[PDB]
Scaffold this active site. Sequence first.
Site, mmCIF file in Angstrom:
data_model
loop_
_atom_site.group_PDB
_atom_site.id
_atom_site.type_symbol
_atom_site.label_atom_id
_atom_site.label_comp_id
_atom_site.label_asym_id
_atom_site.label_seq_id
_atom_site.Cartn_x
_atom_site.Cartn_y
_atom_site.Cartn_z
ATOM 1 N N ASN A 51 55.145 46.790 28.960
ATOM 2 C CA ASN A 51 55.427 45.385 28.689
ATOM 3 C C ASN A 51 55.040 44.978 27.265
ATOM 4 O OD1 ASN A 51 56.411 42.829 29.202
ATOM 5 N ND2 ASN A 51 54.494 42.093 30.122
ATOM 6 N N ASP A 118 51.348 51.856 30.397
ATOM 7 C CA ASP A 118 51.603 50.594 31.109
ATOM 8 C C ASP A 118 52.758 50.848 32.105
ATOM 9 O OD1 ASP A 118 50.892 47.542 31.093
ATOM 10 O OD2 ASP A 118 53.054 47.479 30.690
ATOM 11 N N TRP A 119 53.748 49.954 32.150
ATOM 12 C CA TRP A 119 54.890 50.086 33.058
ATOM 13 C C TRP A 119 55.798 51.256 32.698
ATOM 14 C CZ3 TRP A 119 55.276 48.355 37.720
ATOM 15 C CH2 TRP A 119 54.571 47.225 38.108
ATOM 16 N N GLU A 142 46.514 53.778 30.300
ATOM 17 C CA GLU A 142 46.602 52.357 30.662
ATOM 18 C C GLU A 142 47.792 52.132 31.593
ATOM 19 O OE1 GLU A 142 44.719 49.463 29.595
ATOM 20 O OE2 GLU A 142 43.163 50.978 29.274
ATOM 21 N N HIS A 281 43.901 47.904 25.148
ATOM 22 C CA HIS A 281 45.061 48.290 25.953
ATOM 23 C C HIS A 281 46.098 49.035 25.112
ATOM 24 C CE1 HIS A 281 48.146 48.134 29.051
ATOM 25 N NE2 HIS A 281 48.973 47.618 28.160
HETATM 26 O O1 LIG Z 1 42.912 36.016 30.867
HETATM 27 C C1 LIG Z 1 43.436 35.694 31.925
HETATM 28 C C2 LIG Z 1 43.272 34.287 32.442
HETATM 29 C C3 LIG Z 1 44.410 33.389 32.011
HETATM 30 C C4 LIG Z 1 44.756 33.257 30.665
HETATM 31 C C5 LIG Z 1 45.798 32.412 30.293
HETATM 32 C C6 LIG Z 1 46.496 31.693 31.261
HETATM 33 O O2 LIG Z 1 47.518 30.863 30.910
HETATM 34 C C7 LIG Z 1 46.150 31.825 32.601
HETATM 35 C C8 LIG Z 1 45.109 32.670 32.976
HETATM 36 N N1 LIG Z 1 44.157 36.525 32.682
HETATM 37 C C9 LIG Z 1 44.334 37.848 32.268
HETATM 38 N N2 LIG Z 1 43.338 38.736 32.512
HETATM 39 C C10 LIG Z 1 43.468 40.015 32.127
HETATM 40 C C11 LIG Z 1 44.630 40.435 31.478
HETATM 41 C C12 LIG Z 1 44.787 41.849 31.035
HETATM 42 C C13 LIG Z 1 44.316 42.905 31.821
HETATM 43 C C14 LIG Z 1 44.456 44.220 31.386
HETATM 44 C C15 LIG Z 1 45.074 44.479 30.164
HETATM 45 O O3 LIG Z 1 45.219 45.759 29.736
HETATM 46 C C16 LIG Z 1 45.544 43.429 29.377
HETATM 47 C C17 LIG Z 1 45.399 42.112 29.811
HETATM 48 N N3 LIG Z 1 45.621 39.547 31.233
HETATM 49 C C18 LIG Z 1 45.489 38.259 31.613
HETATM 50 C C19 LIG Z 1 46.623 37.302 31.318
HETATM 51 C C20 LIG Z 1 47.455 37.110 32.560
HETATM 52 C C21 LIG Z 1 48.053 38.214 33.174
HETATM 53 C C22 LIG Z 1 48.819 38.042 34.324
HETATM 54 C C23 LIG Z 1 48.986 36.766 34.860
HETATM 55 C C24 LIG Z 1 48.392 35.662 34.246
HETATM 56 C C25 LIG Z 1 47.622 35.833 33.096
#
Ligand SMILES: O=C(Cc1ccc(O)cc1)Nc1ncc(-c2ccc(O)cc2)nc1Cc1ccccc1
Length: 306
Positions: A51, A118-119, A142, A281
């Site tokens: 992604n 990833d995907w 990842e 990541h």
């Molecule tokens: O950080 C959050 C919380 C969040 C941030 C912004 C928002 O508008 C709502 C919630 N979440 C998060 N927490 C972790 C990761 C993440 C995890 C692993 C990785 O390799 C990269 C990102 N990404 C995310 C972003 C995300 C992903 C999917 C759905 C909603 C929000």
Amino acid sequence: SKVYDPEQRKRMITGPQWWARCKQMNVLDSFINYYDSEKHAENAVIFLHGNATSSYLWRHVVPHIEPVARCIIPDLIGMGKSGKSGNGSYRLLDHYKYLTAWFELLNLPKKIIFVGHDWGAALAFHYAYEHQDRIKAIVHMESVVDVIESEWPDIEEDIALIKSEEGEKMVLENNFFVETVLPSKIMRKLEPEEFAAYLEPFKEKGEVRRPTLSWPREIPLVKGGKPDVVQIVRNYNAYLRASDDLPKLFIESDPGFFSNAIVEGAKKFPNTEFVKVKGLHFLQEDAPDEMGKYIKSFVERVLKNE
Ligand SMILES: O=C(Cc1ccc(O)cc1)Nc1ncc(-c2ccc(O)cc2)nc1Cc1ccccc1
């Protein structure tokens, strides 16, 4: 506070520079843009991004592996400089439809080596499951290694949000994954031209950004995840756990980001060698040469041994 790599600009590859080296091929009702090193076609190493990214992700990794095997790096449908999907759908199996159709036209050898992130890793794993005779080795990182039954405690609430019409606003309107998440998951500061290469396919607002919303909505959460993708991942996970004759390399990120579950999942697959490089990541952006050298040695060892 993140800083530019002071030596990076001296070897920077811009979007235009990378895309100039790519080829296009009609696939089904659309086309795939891809990089192809061509030489040493008795083997094929297929690098699959996930992604928010494109073939561009692998630009500093691939030069290390080209001298030993033909390297082929597509932009997934709807992403990079590839064509769009004929029905505007970008689920895992839509991607897989175009990916597999594309493979049919590449003059691949019997056994293929995959490198997945990833995907992209999910696509490699599903391909492997459905073509168990056609896989020489798998490198992953990842990666979508298994379903999620339980680091990210509110994951369900977040996926619930991304699945609501707010997800449309977050991504189609505000480009959350490309403009906010992507840079946050690279340890260095990207050069402006490098970030521009990631933004370019998704620079316009609206439906063009669909693939970056559709991917997260495919998340194989046992509780609430799309049941067909959950089953796909269960299937290939079981197959990978039994795949003792399939050499694998797992490239772990240090420190990674909520990556503990990925590593533990990866350790359930036999015949896996484990290495570690710097990154969050998008580790290709923080340690591409260490990654390339690790992948090159692995491929070399696999071709010997075989
Ligand atoms: O950080 C959050 C919380 C969040 C941030 C912004 C928002 O508008 C709502 C919630 N979440 C998060 N927490 C972790 C990761 C993440 C995890 C692993 C990785 O390799 C990269 C990102 N990404 C995310 C972003 C995300 C992903 C999917 C759905 C909603 C929000």
